[PDB]
Amino acid sequence: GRGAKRKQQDGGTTGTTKKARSDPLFSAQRLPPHGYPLEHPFNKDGYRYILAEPDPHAPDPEKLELDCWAGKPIPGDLYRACLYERVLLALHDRAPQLKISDDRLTVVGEKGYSMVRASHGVRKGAWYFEITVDEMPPDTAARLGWSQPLGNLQAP
Amino acid sequence: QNYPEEADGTLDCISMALTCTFNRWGTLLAVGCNDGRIVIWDFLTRGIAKIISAHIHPVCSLCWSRDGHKLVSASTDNIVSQWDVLSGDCDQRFRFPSPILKVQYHPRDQNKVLVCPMKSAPVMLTLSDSKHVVLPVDDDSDLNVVASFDRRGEYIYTGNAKGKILVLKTDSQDLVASFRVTTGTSNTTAIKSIEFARKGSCFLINTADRIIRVYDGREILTCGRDGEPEPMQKLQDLVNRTPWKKCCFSGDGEYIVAGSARQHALYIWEKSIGNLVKILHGTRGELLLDVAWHPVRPIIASISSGVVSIWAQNQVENWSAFAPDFKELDENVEYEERESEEDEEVDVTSVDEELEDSKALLYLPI
């Protein structure tokens, strides 16, 4: 009856394993260390993992004690890790090697190549915006421009 | 680079080896064997060049000519002969009334050899006409005097056995400068020898007051007839009081090396700071004969008791030298990738400091 936790820890057989790998310097995210609005950019380019907008699930996996998420999930009212009005870049489709401020204004890269994408599309209207390059040390490429989510977040 | 830090073994092509000296940058070794023969070994190539049947009584010193065509030898049986480097026979033969201590060839005058007779004034023997010219000395003429050239050999310096040093010209013999060594605090001191370098005109003096001193070959003709002694550093050994036998100058012009007699303590200092930097760990039991570094590359090689001990810098290039675009190093940082991804008719024809002690012309591949 205690094998369910081991199955959940090893990885199970539900597709991708339950053992995250984001080994570059990942910061500016994953603030609340509990079951709340969270995010995990993954090593594998193209993995977006988020917990905001929660959901219940079916209880009683292996006739253990009744889980609290049976029909009445626990509530949550705290920090949510995203932005609505105009996403300053993003917090979901990113690489786990980018350092951003708490207010999400500055972007600091890794020892190697890195990028940040956004989460807002443009179809009509004026979007005359700016990227103020605070500083650029030698051997630090600073190419900027629009791209697509299909783009590999670590590819040049 | 810096002082030698590795140790090398011995180089004994034949069992006995008395004297050694480098020619200009350590090309060949002049071994005067204790059997009346003159052997030439190869340096930086680990071989032999020529064996000469000089005479019966063994020799005790060796030097080569400015043009490299002669093999002078301060014989123990007063055979002042000019052995040929090429054929090995004797070119010029002469006899001196007193034996010879220090033989040298002026890098600008090979005609006048350097001779240091005992109880008599130094004599320059001219190889062009076999004529002997006595160097004028001062006061006594029966002292243990040693004569030696400067860097360029343009002035000759002589040391006597009462406390007097003389300065004169290598060819004009205009004795116009003298010098009196310090008299300690109560008792005077004689001079054992002096030794020069190839850059800076500095020279060490070894005396009988158990202390090695250093002067420069520019403050005697500047002071005039005779002034007051004023050495830079009165170096000495103040824990064992080892006497000094043979000591030469550096292969760069900034170091000073001094040799023991039986204690296997080879001391080194630098002219800028008179502070000890390293000491040689020699195995006790043998008497040191000759020391002379590589005149360009820092290394030490001391001959003793028929064998030779070398403390050196053994070097083999790193494995990462396969190609400039190929390296075999270790790092834990992410790789920094690249960020920037005629017709003429002319044939090809093009193929310390340097002095004139060259043209040995001695090499037998077979």
List the helices and strands and how they pair.
This is part of a larger assembly, with chains A (156 residues) and B (366 residues).
Chain A: H1 3-10, E1 99-100, E2 107-108
Antiparallel strand pairs in A: 1-2
Chain B: E1 6-8, E2 28-32, E3 37-42, E4 47-53, E5 63-64, E6 70-72, E7 80-84, E8 90-94, E9 105-106, E10 109-113, E11 123-126, E12 131-134, E13 146-149, E14 155-159, E15 164-169, E16 177-180, E17 191-196, E18 202-207, E19 212-216, H1 220-223, E20 255-258, E21 267-270, E22 288-291, E23 300-304, E24 307-312
Antiparallel strand pairs in B: 1-24, 2-3, 3-4, 5-6, 6-7, 7-8, 9-10, 11-12, 13-14, 14-15, 15-16, 17-18, 18-19, 20-21, 22-23, 23-24
Subcellular location (chain A): Nucleus
Organism (chain A): Homo sapiens
Protein name (chain A): Set1/Ash2 histone methyltransferase complex subunit ASH2
Q: Which key phrases capture this entry?
A:
part of a larger assembly, 2 chains, A: 156 residues, little secondary structure, 3% strand, B: mainly beta, Methylamine Dehydrogenase, Chain H, globular
Structural write-up:
Chain B: Residues 342-351 are annotated as: Interaction with WDR5. Chain B: The modification Phosphothreonine is found at residue 242. Chain B: The modification Phosphoserine is found at residue 340. Chain B: It comes from Homo sapiens. The structure is cut from a larger assembly and holds chains A (156 residues) and B (366 residues). Chain A has 156 residues and is largely without helices or strands. Chain A has one helix at residues 3-10, and strands at residues 99-100, 107-108. In chain B, strands 1-24-23-22 form a 4-stranded antiparallel sheet, with no helix packed on it. In chain B, strand 17 (191-196) and strand 18 form a beta hairpin. Chain B is globular. Chain B has one domain (10-311): Methylamine Dehydrogenase, Chain H (7 Propeller). The longest helix of chain B is centred in the middle third of the chain and has 4 residues, at 220-223. With 366 residues, chain B is an all-beta fold. At the A-B interface, loops of A face loops of B.
